[PDB]
Structure 1
């Protein structure tokens, strides 16, 4: 009955690899209390992309590298290497904000988890969405 929070804004650090890991857990409310079992990520793949705008025809700033850490514990990690961080930093907006000159808007990102197989239905699902920001660094 409560609300979800699909909209998440990420903040990356320039010159540093960014690593985010998501855990999918099955839940239920019954006579016995909340029973949680990790979701088995088999045939589950992720794919995320970043563009500088929502409107059609937006320039693709970069794309995220997807991997699954532990299927039994239902843990998947979504991250990008340091070179991708530099690429996004180059393509970010040059407009600074006072009280914190570090952060600059980089664009919008989405993540779809999908399960593709002959017996599996062609079902996709946008797990998250939001904007990507950059914390500019001076080292390196």
Structure 2
């Protein structure tokens, strides 16, 4: 009955690899209390992309590298290497904000988890969405 929070804004650090890991857990409310079992990520793949705008025809700033850490514990990690961080930093907006000159808007990102197989239905699902920001660094 409560609300979800699909909109998440990420903040990356320039010159540093960014690593985010998501855990999918099955839940239920019954006579016995909340029973949680990790979701088995088999045939589950992720794919995320970043563009500088929502409107059609937006320039693709970069794309995220997807991997699954532990299927039994239902843990998947979505991250990008340091070179991708530099690429996004180059393509970010040059407009600074006072009280914190570090952060600059980089664009919008989405993540779809999908399960593709002959017996599996062609079902996709946008797990998250939001904007990507950059914390500019001076080292390196």
- Please give the alpha-carbon distance, in whole angstroms, between the structure 1 residues aligned to 2:82 and 2:88: 10
Cα deviation for residue 49 of structure 1 reads: 0.0
Give CA-to-partner distance per residue, 1:11-54, whole Å, 9 cap, x none. 00000000000000000000000000000000000000000000
SS in structure 1 opposite 2:62?
Answer: strand
| Unpaired runs of at least 5, structure 2 | none
Please identify runs of 4+ aligned residues in structure 1 that moved more than 2 A: none
SS in structure 2 opposite 1:72?
Answer: coil
- Please give the alpha-carbon distance, in whole angstroms, between the structure 2 residues aligned to 1:130 and 1:47: 15
SS in structure 2 opposite 1:42?
Answer: coil
Cα deviation for residue 96 of structure 1 reads: 0.0
SS in structure 2 opposite 1:130?
Answer: strand
SS in structure 1 opposite 2:54?
Answer: coil
- Please give the alpha-carbon distance, in whole angstroms, between the structure 1 residues aligned to 2:83 and 2:116: 30
- Please give the alpha-carbon distance, in whole angstroms, between the structure 2 residues aligned to 1:62 and 1:38: 31
Cα deviation for residue 138 of structure 1 reads: 0.0
- Please give the alpha-carbon distance, in whole angstroms, between the structure 1 residues aligned to 2:135 and 2:11: 7
Relative to the length of structure 1, the TM-score reads 1.00
SS in structure 2 opposite 1:84?
Answer: helix
| Unpaired runs of at least 5, structure 1 | none
SS in structure 1 opposite 2:87?
Answer: helix
SS in structure 2 opposite 1:132?
Answer: strand
Alignment RMSD (CA, Å): 0.0
Task: Count residues with an aligned counterpart.
Answer: 140
Cα deviation for residue 73 of structure 1 reads: 0.0
Cα deviation for residue 136 of structure 1 reads: 0.0
Tell me what 2:133 maps to: 133
